[PDB]
Amino acid sequence: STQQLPQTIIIGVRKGGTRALLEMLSLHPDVAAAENEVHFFDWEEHYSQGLGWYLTQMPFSSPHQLTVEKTPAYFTSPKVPERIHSMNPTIRLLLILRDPSERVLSDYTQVLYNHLQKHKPYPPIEDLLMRRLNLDYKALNRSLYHAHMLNWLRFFPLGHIHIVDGDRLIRDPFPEIQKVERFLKLSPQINASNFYFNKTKGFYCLRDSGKDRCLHESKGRAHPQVDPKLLDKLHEYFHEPNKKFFKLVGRTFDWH
Numbered sequence: 001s002t003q004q005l006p007q008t009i010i011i012g013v014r015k016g017g018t019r020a021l022l023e024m025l026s027l028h029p030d031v032a033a034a035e036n037e038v039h040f041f042d043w044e045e046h047y048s049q050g051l052g053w054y055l056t057q058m059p060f061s062s063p064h065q066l067t068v069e070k071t072p073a074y075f076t077s078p079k080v081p082e083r084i085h086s087m088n089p090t091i092r093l094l095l096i097l098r099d100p101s102e103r104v105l106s107d108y109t110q111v112l113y114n115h116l117q118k119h120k121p122y123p124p125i126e127d128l129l130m131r132r133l134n135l136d137y138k139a140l141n142r143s144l145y146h147a148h149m150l151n152w153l154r155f156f157p158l159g160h161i162h163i164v165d166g167d168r169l170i171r172d173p174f175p176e177i178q179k180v181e182r183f184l185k186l187s188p189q190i191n192a193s194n195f196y197f198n199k200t201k202g203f204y205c206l207r208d209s210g211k212d213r214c215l216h217e218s219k220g221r222a223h224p225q226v227d228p229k230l231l232d233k234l235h236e237y238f239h240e241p242n243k244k245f246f247k248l249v250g251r252t253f254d255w256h
């Protein structure tokens with residue numbers, strides 16, 4: 001066993017289901033996953049240390065294993081594509097995407113939770129979204145998939161960026177995971193019996209080697225109720241950006 005630079009990276013999107021994807025992929029015997037978000041290419045304190053530092057953060061892997069890490073920030077970080085390209089132009093990238101409006105709500109809910117833990121006030125999402133639609137709200141920008149995808153496609157062939165349907169992963173993960181295995185040239189080792197639905201959790205959980213487990217409590221939070229009129233501004237806001245994205249990647253998703 002040795003440390004190797006990652007042959008694939010889960011690059012985002014933030015709140016798209018990056019942890020679920022990593023854990024599920026790690027069920028494969030030929031996959032070695034970094035346990036934590038590495039934040040190599042996006043944090044200057046990390047990137048300035050060089051690829052040698054990145055290598056030290058990698059899991060140890062056997063000769064027939066792929067090494068993977070997930071850092072959700074990469075996708076929406078302008079500087080990151082060029083840096084990854086510098087490390088490895090032929091790398092295979094995984095991008096997991098959810099409905100952009102739902103992703104916005106997921107993003108808000110996490111930041112709300114962060115504030116609650118610190119006993120700090122945080123405004124209802126309506127306050128952040130409206131001002132007309134508030135275009136200064138950073139979570140909106142992270143859902144502009146077309147805009148960010150353009151930066152990546154300058155450096156990487158579309159064929160080397162596999163898009164995981166995050167909505168479908170939540171509903172029925174196995175078929176999505178099968179496509180990831182194929183994309184990565186992995187043998188189809190994962191099976192439907194590796195997944196079981198937990199009604200208490202409200203999400204699918206993982207079964208392997210006799211051990212059963214659901215994702216961390218921070219994964220799968222209830223979203224707030226939103227003024228319907230505001231939700232409609234939200235859906236409308238993304239309607240055209242979605243069209244542009246569908247044409248860019250040659251694929252449509254069942255989004256609002």
Ligand SMILES: Nc1ncnc2c1ncn2[C@@H]1O[C@H](COP(=O)(O)O)[C@@H](OP(=O)(O)O)[C@H]1O
Nearest residue numbers: 015016017018019020106203204215219220221
């Ligand atoms: N099996 C699973 N268990 C829990 N959450 C899952 C899941 N599969 C997908 N997810 C999604 O992963 C999201 C978090 O993504 P990330 O790890 O990138 O932050 C969750 O967002 P929500 O908490 O809004 O429901 C949830 O929707």
